[PDB]
């Protein structure tokens, strides 16, 4: 207990009388009203020490306040049985579940992967959406960003993705140990969080996965630190527990604004458009938590989600995740506002590990070629959509009309997946060959002869 | 009082070992040159004090200057004998007359209006211009912002507006760093009208200090407040060259080394701008109405500057002057796109002006918008005027620009004359071409 607080300015406070203090140290602040508010040390000096109370210094009298020093940094209670319990921004209970008995305690900061020990993506990962695991294939050890927008149900897409993530490797003929999913929420609305818990408990994936939810009403420190903790959670199931894991981050924009308030907590002059200049490194300690480890069977894959500011791709968030992450999954505001299914623009959709996630033995031999053929059909179909919007439908050419039907179909069918609906990769290849069958055999220059002879039937 | 000072940063002065200091107080200082001036205390901290000079700190010795502090805030001598006369930036008579007898003495800062005692004016005051009283309805008691550009004749238009306007309406003017030529032209117009005897103002010119003009506007504001709360008559307050006032306030905040915003403006300016708009409004039980109608110049002919942005966001509606229409050679250049009046609501309809008022206003906005898009189309595409709708839209836009937009400065037209002129001008477009006009409005004028 320390009443030695020197002064309180905003959420951060300074306290004299400190000996042998550390960085990012935890402290428990008992306020004058008897309230217990947790806090973390922002900085330390030889005279006093600066901490930050998550509950704020509001209503806390510097005279009558007491401070108990924990003497330790940010840590996590790692366990193999940790899966199935719900927690809050501070790692405390949320859904009123049980208290997990910890197998081992670890630091939340973690450590980066050694250069010679890194392993590339090999095994394919099924996304489950008709527009996701098919067009741009995804594999374990790949960084795939998901760009959503304002008014876009990125929550529902994340729920469908989590519902389809469990079945990602049913066709693998690793089966005994269920794939672990990690949900981290930062600055989410009440309706979205409630629907998240309701759908998570309803799908039954709430038991086989882990959820940490920090809402908008909650402090920024909870939402910002939620990510590193969940990262340690995915790290424990890979290097130690050795199991297949999948990471998903929701509302990275709120975590960016939270990181902005946290960076402003050091009272530093902000950079361009109110963002820290170290944000490159801030994301570099985040997206670097994904990959395959050499000698370890368990691999961790991450697919974050972020809202582009004011419907602009010039946004610092998009620009930061752009050169860093491998490929990007965007959202078309046109497809979402036309009353259709998942609005991922076929042009913008790409994945760098798509080379390792398809083919015979990985996904299918009908995957890549037909993907490129369908994408070309949608693109040329759009070009024909503009050309027919010019000279009319009487001027429609062979490839033009073929692309018109192919575009209308791909848009109203191929694009259409479902809300909770998850279709198998085989269903994707079959629906693809069948929908592309509308065109003749020579109408697709994107197809190989061997493929055309061994597939079309 | 202290004759001993610590240091001096620009116009701002700071003294040490001062007692019984008053923040925002009137202070009389006698300098080394024998010159005496007035100033206002910015702040007081501990045993030290910080006061500012309104007339400037130039030509003063730290030892030979003596600062007499009243210990109380600034109190202006409001009187009813100020009619037809003139005062300087410091309040001193510039009319070469003597000091008038003061009826009362109160703060120049004015007083906050009570929440339950306020009154929403529906009053309709004829502007006199066909493009003014119609487009943006002129109402006594309302607040209409005015943003102009450099080299723009805003003074001429404002003068023609005050002249063709006129129980008569008393006008009170407030000059902040006003130009010599501007003052000369305003004097020429006010004298040409003959209403100069019924008007009064505090003059702080460009040759004179503009930093003491910030209080001059406040003085004229207290004058309007005293005119509304006592004399019970229609009052109109005006702040001239408010851009210089914003630049000066920005200089005062910059000298304070405080947190600067856009264009050097202060951080608490959110309230400060309100003080410029707090010079308007009526009260419950008062027959008189006070309405502030300030005019400022947007920097580099850009309304995107903090000044025009705050002036537009705070006050309801703004009167815009286009540089193109002013360079065209036609009369007064009000842009129907940017210009608007929130007081054009209660002042329209039957019982106020006419039942064809609001409809013709909205139809005018639609015709101007369609004409503008038709102008963009006529520029991008050929001279074929983009089929039918755009042809009638562009023709009606140009016709309304050469007629309705320009009513003249020396001509005073009623609202009915403008309505009839618009009735003759809207005949080029079809009756079904107006989507803003209802069934009654279409059957309104068939004459």
């Amino acid at each position: 207990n320390y009443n030695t607080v020197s002064g309180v300015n905003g959420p951060l406070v300074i306290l004299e009388k400190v000996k042998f203090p550390r960085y990012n140290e935890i402290v428990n602040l008992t306020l004058p009203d008897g309230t217990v508010r947790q806090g973390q040390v922002l900085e330390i000096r030889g005279d006093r020490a600066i901490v930050q109370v998550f509950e704020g210094t509001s209503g806390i009298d510097v005279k009558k306040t007491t401070v108990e020093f924990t003497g330790e940094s940010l840590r996590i209670p790692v366990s193999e049985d940790m899966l199935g319990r719900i927690f809050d921004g501070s790692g405390r209970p949320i859904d009123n579940g049980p208290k997990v008995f910890a197998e081992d305690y670890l630091d939340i900061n973690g450590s980066p992967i050694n250069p010679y020990a890194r392993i590339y993506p090999e095994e394919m990962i099924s996304t489950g959406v008709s527009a996701i695991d098919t067009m741009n294939s995804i594999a374990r050890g790949q960084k795939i960003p998901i760009f959503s927008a304002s008014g876009l149900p990125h929550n529902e897409i994340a729920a469908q993705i989590c519902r389809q993530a469990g079945l990602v490797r049913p066709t693998k003929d690793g089966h005994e140990e269920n794939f672990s999913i990690v949900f981290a929420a930062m600055g989410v609305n009440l309706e979205t969080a409630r629907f998240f818990k309701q759908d998570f408990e309803e799908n039954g994936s709430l038991e086989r996965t882990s959820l940490f939810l920090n809402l908008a009403n909650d402090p920024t420190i909870e939402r910002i630190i939620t990510p590193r903790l969940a990262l340690t959670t995915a790290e424990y199931l890979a290097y130690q527990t050795e199991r297949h894991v999948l990471t998903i981050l929701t509302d990275m924009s709120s975590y960016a604004d939270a990181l902005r308030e946290v960076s402003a907590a050091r009272e530093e002059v902000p950079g361009r458009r109110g963002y820290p200049g170290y944000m490159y490194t801030d994301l570099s300690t985040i997206y670097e938590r994904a990959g395959r480890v050499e000698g370890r069977n368990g691999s961790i894959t991450q697919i974050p989600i972020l809202t582009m500011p004011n419907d602009d791709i010039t946004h610092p968030i998009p620009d930061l995740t752009g050169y860093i992450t491998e490929g990007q999954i965007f959202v078309d505001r046109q497809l979402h506002n036309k009353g259709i299914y998942p609005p991922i623009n076929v042009l913008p959709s790409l994945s760098r590990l798509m080379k390792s996630a398809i083919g015979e033995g990985m996904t299918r031999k009908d995957h890549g070629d037909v993907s490129n053929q369908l994408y070309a059909k949608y693109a040329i179909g759009k070009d024909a959509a503009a050309m027919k919007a010019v000279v009319g439908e009487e001027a429609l050419s062979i490839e033009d009309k073929l692309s018109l039907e192919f575009l209308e179909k791909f848009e109203k069918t191929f694009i259409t997946q479902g809300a909770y609906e998850d279709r198998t990769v085989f269903e994707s290849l079959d629906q693809a060959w069948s929908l592309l069958r509308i065109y003749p055999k020579e109408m697709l220059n994107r197809i190989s002869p061997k493929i055309l002879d061994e597939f079309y039937d | 009082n202290y004759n001993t000072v610590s240091g001096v940063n620009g116009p701002l002065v700071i003294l040490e070992k001062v007692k019984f200091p008053r923040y925002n107080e009137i202070v009389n200082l006698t300098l080394p040159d024998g010159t005496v001036r007035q100033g206002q205390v910015l702040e007081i901290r501990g045993d030290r004090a910080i006061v500012q000079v309104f007339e400037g700190t130039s030509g003063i010795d730290v030892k030979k200057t003596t600062v007499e502090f009243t210990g109380e805030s600034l109190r202006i001598p409001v009187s009813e004998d100020m009619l037809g006369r003139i005062f300087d930036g410091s309040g001193r008579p510039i009319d070469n007359g003597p000091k008038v007898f003061a009826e009362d003495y109160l703060d120049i800062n004015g007083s906050p209006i009570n929440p339950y005692a306020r009154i929403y004016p529906e009053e309709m005051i004829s502007t006199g211009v066909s493009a003014i009283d119609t487009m943006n309805s002129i109402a006594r008691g309302q607040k209409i912002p005015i943003f102009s550009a450099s080299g723009l004749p805003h003074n001429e238009i404002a003068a023609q507006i005050c002249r063709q306007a006129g129980e008569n309406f008393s006008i009170v003017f407030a000059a902040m760093g006003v130009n010599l030529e501007t003052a000369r032209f305003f004097k020429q117009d006010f004298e040409e009208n003959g209403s100069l005897e019924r008007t009064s103002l505090f003059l702080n010119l460009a040759n004179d200090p503009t930093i003491e003009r910030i209080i001059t506007p406040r003085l004229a504001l207290t004058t309007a407040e005293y005119l509304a709360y006592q004399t019970e008559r229609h009052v109109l307050t005006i702040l001239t060259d408010m851009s210089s006032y914003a630049d000066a306030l920005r200089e005062v905040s910059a000298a304070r080394e405080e947190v600067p915003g856009r264009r050097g403006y202060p951080g608490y300016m959110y309230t400060d701008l309100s003080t410029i708009y707090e010079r308007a409004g009526r009260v419950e039980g008062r027959n008189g109405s006070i309405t502030q109608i300030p005019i400022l110049t947007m920097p580099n002919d850009d309304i995107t500057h903090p000044i025009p942005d705050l002036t537009g966001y705070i006050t309801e509606g703004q009167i815009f002057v286009d540089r193109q229409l002013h360079n065209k050679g036609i009369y007064p250049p009000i842009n129907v796109l940017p210009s608007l009046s929130r007081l054009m609501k209660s002042a329209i309809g039957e019982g106020m002006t006419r039942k064809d008022h609001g409809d013709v206003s909205n139809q005018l906005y639609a015709k101007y918008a369609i004409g503008k898009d038709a102008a963009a189309m006529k520029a991008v595409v050929g001279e074929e005027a983009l089929s039918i709708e755009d042809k009638l839209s562009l023709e009606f836009l140009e016709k309304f620009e050469k007629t309705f937009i320009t009513q003249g400065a020396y001509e005073d037209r009623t609202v009915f004359e403008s309505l009839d002129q618009a009735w003759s001008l809207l005949r080029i477009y079809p009756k079904e071409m107006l989507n803003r006009i209802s069934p009654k409005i279409l059957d309104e004028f068939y004459d």
């Binding site: 530093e268 002059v269 | 080394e257 947190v259 600067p260």
Partner: peptide, 21 residues
């Protein structure tokens, strides 16, 4: 502005050290 706050804070620190001395 941030540099001004840092310098003012450094002056505060200097004042604290002076008080300590």
């Amino acid at each position: 502005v941030q540099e001004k706050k840092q310098n003012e804070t450094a002056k505060l620190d200097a004042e604290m050290k002076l008080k300590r001395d």
